[PDB]
Design a protein around this nucleic acid. Sequence first.
RNA 1: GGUGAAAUUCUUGGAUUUAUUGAAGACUAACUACUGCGAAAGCAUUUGCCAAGGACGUUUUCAUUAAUCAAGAACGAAAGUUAGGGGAUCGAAGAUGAUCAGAUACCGUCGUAGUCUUAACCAUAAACUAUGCCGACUAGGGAUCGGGUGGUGUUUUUCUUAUGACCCACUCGGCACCUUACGAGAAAUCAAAGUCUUUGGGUUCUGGGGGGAGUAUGGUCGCAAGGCUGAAACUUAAAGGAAUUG
Lengths: 23, 87, 97, 199, 127, 214, 100
Amino acid sequence: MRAKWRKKRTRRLKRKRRKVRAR
Amino acid sequence: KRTKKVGITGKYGVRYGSSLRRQVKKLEVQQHATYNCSFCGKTCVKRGAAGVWSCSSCNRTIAGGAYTLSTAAAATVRSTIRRLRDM
Amino acid sequence: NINQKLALVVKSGKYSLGYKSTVKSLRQGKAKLIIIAANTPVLRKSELEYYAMLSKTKVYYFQGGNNELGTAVGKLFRVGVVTILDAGDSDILTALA
Amino acid sequence: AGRGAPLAKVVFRDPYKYKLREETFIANEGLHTGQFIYAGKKASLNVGNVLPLGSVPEGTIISNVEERPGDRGALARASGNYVIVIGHNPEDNKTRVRLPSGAKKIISSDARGVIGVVAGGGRIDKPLLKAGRAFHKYRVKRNSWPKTRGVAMNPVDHPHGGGNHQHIGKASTISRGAVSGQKAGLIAARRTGLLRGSQ
Amino acid sequence: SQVFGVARIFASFNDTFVHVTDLSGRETIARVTGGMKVKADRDESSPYAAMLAAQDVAAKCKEVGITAVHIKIRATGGTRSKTPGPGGQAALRALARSGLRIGRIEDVTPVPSDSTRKKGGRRGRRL
Amino acid sequence: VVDPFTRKEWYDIKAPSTFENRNVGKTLVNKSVGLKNASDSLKGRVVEVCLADLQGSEDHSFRKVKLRVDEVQGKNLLTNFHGMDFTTDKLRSMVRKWQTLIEANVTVKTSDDYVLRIFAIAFTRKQANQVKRTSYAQSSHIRQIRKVISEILTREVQNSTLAQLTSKLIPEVINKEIENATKDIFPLQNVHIRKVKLLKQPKFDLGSLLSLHG
Amino acid sequence: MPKKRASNGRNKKGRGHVKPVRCVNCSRSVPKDKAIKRMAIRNIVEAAAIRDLSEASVYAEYALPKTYNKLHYCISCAIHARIVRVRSRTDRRIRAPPQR
RNA sequence: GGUGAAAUUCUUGGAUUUAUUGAAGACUAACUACUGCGAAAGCAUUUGCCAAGGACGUUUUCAUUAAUCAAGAACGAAAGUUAGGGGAUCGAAGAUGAUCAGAUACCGUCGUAGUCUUAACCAUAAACUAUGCCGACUAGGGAUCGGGUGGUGUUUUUCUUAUGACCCACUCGGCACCUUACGAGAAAUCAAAGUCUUUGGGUUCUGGGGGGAGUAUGGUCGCAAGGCUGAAACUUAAAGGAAUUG
Ligand SMILES: [Zn+2]
């Protein structure tokens, strides 16, 4: 799909992995 | 060069936060730093209390800003009254 | 302009910088034209006008401070007043400035 | 001490005696020591000079303005503040004036005002950081600092106080027609909550 | 013989003024608009209202004592249109038909010598 | 039902005094109600009128002349030239395609303390024996034309005590001297004054205005 | 869609990206080159009379001026009746104006 | 007011409209074009300083000092980010009227941030002539913008003037056009997309069926937003360019 919704998928990839990794 | 960026505000250490420490750094550089004098010509140092500057090597004092000599809000008034003085 | 002609006095010509050396020259009737700065004080500026009109000498007011009058003469220091005794290839005595 | 404004002390002569009287002026940004100042109706329009509002054109800037004539100063004496002249009237000696909050006011034409913006501007910009900096500000003014929150207090000491959880309980918006003791909160509020842009 | 005034017509879209005044400009006589007479929202600017507005204006000034006028037409102006509306030139005839004299005419729409922004957006009124 | 139209006066406006006809129109004012005079709302008015009405010919039907009201001498209220201006439709006809136009602004004071802003339009001429379409002058030539337009206006004004200046301006004298002076640099055509605004003035001086009326 | 025209929006050539200008009808932003600039002169009195005003008026000759309104139209708006009308393949090439 | 028809509207204790002015912050119309200048992005009221710059003219000057360039640097629309000032108009968010089967969409009335600037940042666009620079050679045709030449040419007229401004021919450099293809091309079209199976003037960069994917991971750069770098497992026989009929 267009590269702002695909691109908004990196919000819930990065910031969710921040809770994961810093642990 | 010792510090990567912190500059003058490294005295506070790790306290108060990043956003406030940079906010202080912009103003605390100006008040401690030197001027270029209008009457004399010489340029060191000088500052003593908020508003009052300063004398280099001559002994004259000037009403300036809190953390700077030339306040830009007063500099435009210096030109505004210049225009109205003509008539 | 005045900045062009002052360069032509320095090379091939004579001049004395500073307040005391100006008064030494004005007393003896040597100076032909003195160049007073802007930021110089009024008490000093009024004195040189009175010294000049006795011996009858031109007093051109240089529009600009002492820091840029020093750069005009080709030096690395502030100057308040510049006399002109004998200009060689220059042409500032003939003109008004 | 304890004032956002550098003062200035000017020496005038006595017209009727061989003497000198010093007057304490608030220095506008532009003044310096060893400078002349011209105060009166016939005085000219420069930074520092004191003129009456009638002999001044529209769109000028002033400070230390008198409400009456003979008030000796009232309006716009704080740091980085200035009054702007808008209008004029021939019938009724009364100029139109805008105060630094926003609310305009009609002042008499013979009232005074010192020209220029008040010195020591940009004082509020720097943050205080450490609490000791805030202590030293109020140390040379009043005893108005370490303020405890009223909800944290007991129900005897303050209306909001009391309860198992720290809550107010009833509306903090209190009327104008109240009495002393009750008035703790927002007094005679038109709006509440977060305001957007325009004041 | 000839006492003059200024007729003034604001020929814009959706409205038509007829604003008669003296030579200086302050003292007015009549201000009968197109939308005052015909009451149906749509028919404020149309030629029907332009006739009826001018006839009422003619009856006012002839009772007072003003024979002729200087017509000075005005469009919406500024950033808007700069185009006279439907009931622009219908106002000029209705004064002549009634028997009120005319002299000197101009259009004085305020054309901005370099202007501020216009409405709609960058893509305009997409209908 | 008040009927305020019938409770009003009628007065005469007067021309001071370089124009041939010394009367214009018939303005009206409300009656002087107890303690409030009608003369307070008469002085300060501005009556803009055509120039051809003041003289006659349609050569001068190209302009607008304002008349600032001043005094009241037995209903004949007196005026004074407030400003000059070209009409709306008669200067846009001049700005044609395929030719450069020029303009120069001037600020000057007369012998009397009267500040006057004053402009001057000038277009480029199409020469005879031209195969070319355009007639554009270079930027170097126009800035020398803009020099000379300012000089001639600063010579005639500064001289002439306002009142005398209008008698020169009405019968296009200023337009001729710019044409002949600048033809060495560039031919030019039309050459007009456009506007003459009046910003500042001295004391009222009511009796000095009367010297015109006579 | 392949290459349609050579010049395209037209006169931006030996020149960077230029100033725009608003349309009359839509109030839409469009380049000043790609503008469709009609110049419409109109009589200030409508020609359906025209005598009726001048019969009752004062003065002889009479100026009777004209408004000088220059107009701009954002391409798609101009196809509604204005100076366009879609052309054929080889008819496109004619830069000479119709009539006169 | 505002609409195709409307409306919450705004107001009457003349709002709208008229005339005199005053303050504030914007943008520089018409003149404005198959014109100019700039390495690009981009630049349009007047005057004064400040240093740079292309072309042209030259029996001046030095005498290969040049071309293209990994690494590494300089600038770089609009939006956006911090922190100040400013804050008129239009205006994402958002309120709020209609239409509509629903409309939180297009239409309308307001409307925060933003739009302007001062110090920092960010480094991307259909940043498009979708055509990398330096060098030759090949075909005609008139216009135009800047110089430089010659014409007892025409005018300006203050008398010859002498400049200027026009005309006729010529010449270097520049933005572009027209007509033909003998050449080239898949063709639309192109005086360069020509001088290529008769293949070789010098040199930098990018690409190798479609998707997954400008994603994963690791570096590196930014306050952030995100840039620069950049895979595979696994899936599939087509995806696509230009033209002709209907
Ligand atoms: Zn449009």
